[PDB]
Design a protein around this ligand. Sequence first.
Ligand SMILES: CCO/N=C\c1ccc(OCC[C@@H](C)CCn2ccn(-c3ccncc3)c2=O)cc1
Lengths: 235, 260, 260, 116
Amino acid sequence: QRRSRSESTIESFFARGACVAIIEVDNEEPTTRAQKLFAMWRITYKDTVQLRRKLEFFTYSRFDMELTFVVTANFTNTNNGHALNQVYQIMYIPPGAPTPKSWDDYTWQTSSNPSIFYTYGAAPARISVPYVGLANAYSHFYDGFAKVPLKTDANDQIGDSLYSAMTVDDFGVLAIRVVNDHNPTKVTSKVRIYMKPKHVRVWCPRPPRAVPYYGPGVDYKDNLNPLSEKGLTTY
Amino acid sequence: RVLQLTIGNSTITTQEAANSVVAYGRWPEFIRDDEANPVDQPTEPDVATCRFYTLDTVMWGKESKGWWWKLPDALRDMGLFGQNMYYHYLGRSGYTVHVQCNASKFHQGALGVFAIPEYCLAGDSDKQRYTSYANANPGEKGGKFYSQFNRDTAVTSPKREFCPVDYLLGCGVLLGNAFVYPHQIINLRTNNSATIVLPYVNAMAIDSMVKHNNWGIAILPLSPLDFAQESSVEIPITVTIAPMCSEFNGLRNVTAPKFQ
Amino acid sequence: RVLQLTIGNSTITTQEAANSVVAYGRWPEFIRDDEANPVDQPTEPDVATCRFYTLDTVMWGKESKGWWWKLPDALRDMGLFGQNMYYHYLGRSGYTVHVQCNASKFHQGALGVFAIPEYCLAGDSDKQRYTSYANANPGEKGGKFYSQFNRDTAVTSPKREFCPVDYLLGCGVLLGNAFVYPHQIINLRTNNSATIVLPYVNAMAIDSMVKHNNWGIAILPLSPLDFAQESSVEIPITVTIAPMCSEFNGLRNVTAPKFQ
Amino acid sequence: FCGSMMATGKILVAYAPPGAQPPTSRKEAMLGTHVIWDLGLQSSCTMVVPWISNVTYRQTTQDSFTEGGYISMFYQTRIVVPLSTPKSMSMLGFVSACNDFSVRLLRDTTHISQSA
Ligand SMILES: CCO/N=C\c1ccc(OCC[C@@H](C)CCn2ccn(-c3ccncc3)c2=O)cc1
């Protein structure tokens, strides 16, 4: 037959890795504005649109994870004093671990939480995470509730829940801060976390989303005209 | 040729037999693990709970646009299977959806029977994923569809209910792509009955059934029924669900959820 | 020496173990007939319904005179065994009556645990065998005895209830002859717990349980409790019943009898 | 139970798997897995709470989706106490884990603090 089908296997269908988020980080004194001394990011896939619609063909799936960090920087003043090289600390935090609350807390000591000290100017960092699903697969599109409001509850605001959410805090957070001190000048930096799946095995395919997304759920608000206009008997 | 379909004690035979489509080609079975650590036996009412439960009858008209149920929501009201679901902690079940719809040789119109695993639905308001438990589960009467999207604007009285659109199927996909699910098409020209066998599909090996819904049965009118000359006409559509190989574990006190 | 008594999922062990008397020397078993014509399998919830159901606690005093229950009356209110009794037509069951009553080394008094197959009872009025269904079945709280016979004379408002006498035991026999039934004597001097295993005894092989009652548990104070010097004293008596090897057959609609 | 020698009684301890209402009294708590624990013969219970879970691994945070269950203790009988004996007995409470116990995904904790 001589038609190599192996170019479009499942390991090759998710072989290209894409972007998932953009995280800011700044370095100045804490003013009355937004204190961007460090930024937390909720770990999820559904923050872009290249990868969400590419994963949500499939109901159940399990696969190992590989990340990649890309760091760029800028300035804010024209003839700024020439500042030095910087060290960015990407610190992973599982659920239950204490959320950091300032620039230098005791929880930043990475006592057991695995982290990566990254040096600016070198190659992009390249780490791998095994399968951390507590069930036998990850669950795209969970249906039911987390809690059920019973008949003999206290009131209706306690037994209430959120539609289609297995966990309040899905799989932990990231945390990014500059190791170096504050400066009279400031260096705005952006971080683009990439994400490449490996060893992918899926189940139960479903048709892809076509109207644009609206929040983390499955609902929709706008652009309710997915098809164009074209004459019937006319080619 | 005539199907002698008997699971448990009741029996649906037929005057004319058409098909039987098994979802994903795997018949439902028990837990077959020779190296499993619990080798003690749970409660398996395998020949004492397989009655053909019949839901309520909906009257399909010309301008009516669809129906949708949830499983195992559609058995919580009636049947002793409903009592073996509130008391126990968790379970697993395989279903036999058997949708029949009989009419004469002079009608027309096409139906579509679906079975979506993890059938989510869209909200209506601008508050995202904000839906109460009473509207989340229609039970045995089932919900309906709507033709065009009409959201809510009242910020004082929250509606907190679903409002799906039929050609968006609730999830947000086109109707023409919905046939990758296991399905069966009731064409009123040839046959009048249809059946689908569903196995247990979930991420776990076994799960609770109060706070979870595996399958959602969606019925879509592919072509509306037109009679010879009139404009108002009512034929019924009746859906039958029976569990297969069901088992439960972990007794507790009785839990009665509210339904407003 | 210490009994590790586990049937099903729950477990009653003890700090001190005394005895276990099997009624009539035959352990409960299934239907063992190799030449039986129905070889298909009924519903046998043998490891999913054997919880130790505990009845309500009665406060045994000095002048209180006795208590009596009916089985399977005492399980119709609570438990999933109650749901597998209203829906099905008929069944069979073996019971583990486990009456415990703990008190100090300084009390005294003797109890008596009985198990009468087909425990009939006497009426009260001159109308013979004229007793309604609500008074025929006390359920889980159980009836009591009386010291002397006090019948009814009011012909306008019918009482329609039982009124047994304790030393006539309700049936019409002497108390001293009651030990030919299977029994166990809680002597408060030595031991505090007691247990009796009852097999299924009926004229049929299998019977309905709504309109029939196999066993009646009668508790008789053989000597009244006296403390050192006082005259009012309350210790509890708690009775535990668990089914064994129970099975049912013949599903039907739900039947709810009235209880006035 | 660290009470006197002469006082006896019976205590019922129960387990309730989640998804129901919290058990309040004896009528709705005896349905689950329970142990009629005595006081006269021995003075130490043992309750092997089994592993009945929908997921394989549960979490270690207060999350409503993966909840453990409930534990309740009730008087089976009143504590029979003879005269010339104290009325306020006392009971301790222990915990353990059998040999089927396992964790994963090591992380750092929250109970320690340093405000410096
Ligand atoms: C050593 C330090 O830094 N490293 C990194 C690290 C990063 C991420 C980690 O966890 C992994 C994540 C991931 C598997 C994500 C994805 N995933 C796939 C589906 N979902 C999910 C489910 C339901 N809701 C939202 C999304 C979801 O969150 C672990 C370790």
